[PDB]
Design a protein around this nucleic acid. Structure first.
Lengths: 146, 205, 101
RNA sequence: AACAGUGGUAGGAGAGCGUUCUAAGGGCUGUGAAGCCAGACCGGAAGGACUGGUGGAGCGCUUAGAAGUGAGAAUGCCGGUA
RNA sequence: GACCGAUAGUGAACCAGUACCGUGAGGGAAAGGUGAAAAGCACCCCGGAAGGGGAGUGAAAGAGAUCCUGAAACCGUGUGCCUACAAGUAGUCAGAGCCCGUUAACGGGUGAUGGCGUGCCUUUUGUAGAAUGAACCGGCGAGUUACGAUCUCGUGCAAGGUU
RNA sequence: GAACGAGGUAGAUGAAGAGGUCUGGAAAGGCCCGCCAUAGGAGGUAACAGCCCUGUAGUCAAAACUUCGUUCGA
């Protein structure tokens, strides 16, 4: 294909809607905004929560609890992701990073108990779930805590 | 990916095997189109500024009182409908570039090279050595190689002497083996390559 | 410019094509050159102060220097111009010839 | 092919027309382009050709892109004239 | 320079921050284009001149000092058709007569006479409205961009995507 | 508080067709032929020019001031 026969992907290009140009297209004199409204004038928007002076929803609703500066969100991984590694291999958070299974080590790696695993591994992770531990001991792998 | 190899004086040699993953890929028309549009927009620099109402050296005072005057109600002398100027929503200085994924751009460049392969305008010229920067020598070289319309030459190492000579033509330009793009490849309609740059771009891709 | 006052020159363009003429004028302010026997305008003339005449004066008119090249003094054809030095002062040396001026 | 439908404001959706630049390919032009003026031509529409006259150097088409992109009204503004 | 091409672009392409207005602070315009070369109209006639008519230059004089092109409003001059018993959003459609003959096609101009028929826009429940706006002509003149968000569409990869 | 290299401020050199023919008022335009190109940037040239001119690429140039790099303690 040369330049003088350029074809885009059909349905990937859309013409712009030039409002307020003539009457045949529609959106003519009023430019598609109705009549005489507060919204119909320039800058005429209302605040996004504002509902006509009626005391809004977030104000009618009370506040909830806190958050803490100390929050250890553990890097989630389930057992199905463990099947990618070969038999009899050692897995460590660093090797998890190089394999890209987890994109951010962050507070710490923690395995969780969904998926079927039938492989022998030496898994090194900070936190375990009880189902994960019984699953890896059923498979024959060793779950030791870092 | 089995294009015949040619010499300097138009002599031909044994054909060269080419990478299938780079030169035999079925091209993607939409991706090639978007890659064209991408750097086609990126080349333009878009410097254009036109004076908005607030900055047109004047305005200021109210020209006359609101009521009690036969004239229409009116604000500053510099105003949009006013003759003196003040334009609204004019062109503003801004950037006309964005970015595409690495996979997309590599797929696009593979697509265009493979397209050139399948319509057979690739001519490979190994060991392109010229002892002088004179232009009529490579002009006779191109006439022997039988190219009439535009073309593009890629040679990586001999660029320091070829680049002075070949820059004479308006429609013909050298490029390094690194600097392969889409506009130069599509527009020049006849891609001249050397085998060293073939392997270089081959391992790059 | 490459042409000088007092040169034997040859004209390229205009109505006057390929005719010999001598140079007695030069206008470097506007690259404007008056050659003998070219641009033969016919100026309407009123009496000039105490001169009691009335008529049409037929006289020269100047042309542009880009339409004029000088000739080879040896072979006689119109030739291009180059610059060269000869024992102190530089000299005007035409191309395809070793002679000066 | 058959069947049915086809008023319409706010509005919502889909098709398009036209203008100025920009690339690609094609070509038109002192053997007269652009523009202007006049015709009884063509398309569903926005519009588009053809032939004369003026005019005396620039401009279509194809495909795509980007818009300071389309005026009849705002006691709009400027110029000209009733 | 996918910036403007003289109502644009700086206010200012031109002797512009000028002319002009204001006591002063200040405000603040309009106004580009003969020709390639002035070769810019010798000479004759009208006339006081201006201005014209000739002659001459040029490729052009309709090109002669706002001098490329010269639209429209507006204003004139000849005319083909019609008009002094007729009231008419001034049309439309029938329609005889008369005149002309074309991007040749069930043509063109004018139309005595008949039927029907209260402009445009805005705002209104409702306008022919005695509600509003427009003397006319020409030019200019109103939904864009930035950064985010969301949704659809379409692309590349896909439990990964991506700088 | 020296002499040395590179710049800056003026500049110089710099290839190739009035090629033939047609229209034209005028060819830079059309057709048929050549040449240069480290130079086909651009402008002007009676119309649209790489080879008409100014130039352009390279290659040089400073009497005088000026700006940058080599010398004179635990």
């Amino acid at each position: 294909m040369k330049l003088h026969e350029l074809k885009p992907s059909e349905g990937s290009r859309k013409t712009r809607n030039r409002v307020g140009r003539g009457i045949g297209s529609g959106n003519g004199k009023t430019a598609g905004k109705g009549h005489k409204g507060q919204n119909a004038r320039s800058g005429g928007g209302v605040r996004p929560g504002f509902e006509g002076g009626q005391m809004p929803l977030f104000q009618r609703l009370p506040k909830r609890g806190f958050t803490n500066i100390n929050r250890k969100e553990y890097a989630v991984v389930n057992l199905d992701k463990l099947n990618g590694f070969a038999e009899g291999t050692e897995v460590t958070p660093e090797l998890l990073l190089e394999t890209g299974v987890i994109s951010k080590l962050n507070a710490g790696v923690k395995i969780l108990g969904n998926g079927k695993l039938e492989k022998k591994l030496t898994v090194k992770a900070n936190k375990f779930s009880a189902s994960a531990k019984e699953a890896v001991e059923a498979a024959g792998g060793t779950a030791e805590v870092i | 990916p089995k294009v015949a190899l040619y010499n300097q004086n138009g002599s031909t040699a044994g054909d060269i095997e080419l990478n299938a993953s780079v030169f035999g890929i079925e091209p993607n028309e939409s991706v090639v189109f978007d890659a064209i549009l991408m750097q086609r927009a990126s080349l333009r620099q878009g410097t254009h500024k036109v004076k908005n109402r607030s900055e047109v050296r004047g305005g200021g005072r109210k020209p006359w009182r609101q009521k009690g005057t036969g004239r229409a109600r009116q604000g500053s002398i510099r105003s949009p409908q006013w003759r003196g100027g003040g334009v609204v929503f004019g062109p503003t200085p801004r950037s006309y570039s964005y970015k595409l994924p690495k996979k997309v751009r590599r797929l696009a460049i593979k697509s265009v090279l493979s397209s050139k392969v399948i319509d057979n305008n690739i001519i490979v010229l190994e060991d392109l050595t010229l002892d002088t920067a004179k232009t009529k020598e490579m002009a006779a070289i191109l006439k022997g190689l039988s190219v009439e319309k535009k073309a593009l030459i890629v040679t990586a190492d001999a660029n320091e002497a070829v680049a002075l000579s070949a820059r004479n033509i308006p429609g013909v330009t050298v490029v390094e083996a690194n600097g392969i793009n889409v506009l130069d490849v599509v527009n020049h309609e006849k891609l001249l390559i050397t085998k060293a740059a073939v392997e270089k771009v081959e391992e790059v891709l | 410019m490459h042409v000088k006052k007092g040169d034997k020159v040859m004209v390229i363009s205009g109505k006057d094509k390929g005719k010999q003429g001598t140079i007695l004028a030069a206008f470097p302010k506007k690259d404007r050159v008056l050659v003998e026997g070219v641009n033969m305008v016919k100026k309407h003339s009123k009496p000039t102060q105490a001169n009691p005449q009335g008529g049409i004066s037929n006289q020269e008119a100047p042309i542009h220097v880009s339409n004029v090249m000088p000739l080879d003094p040896k072979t006689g054809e119109v030739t291009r111009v180059g610059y060269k030095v000869e024992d102190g002062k530089k000299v005007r040396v035409a191309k395809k010839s070793g002679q000066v001026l």
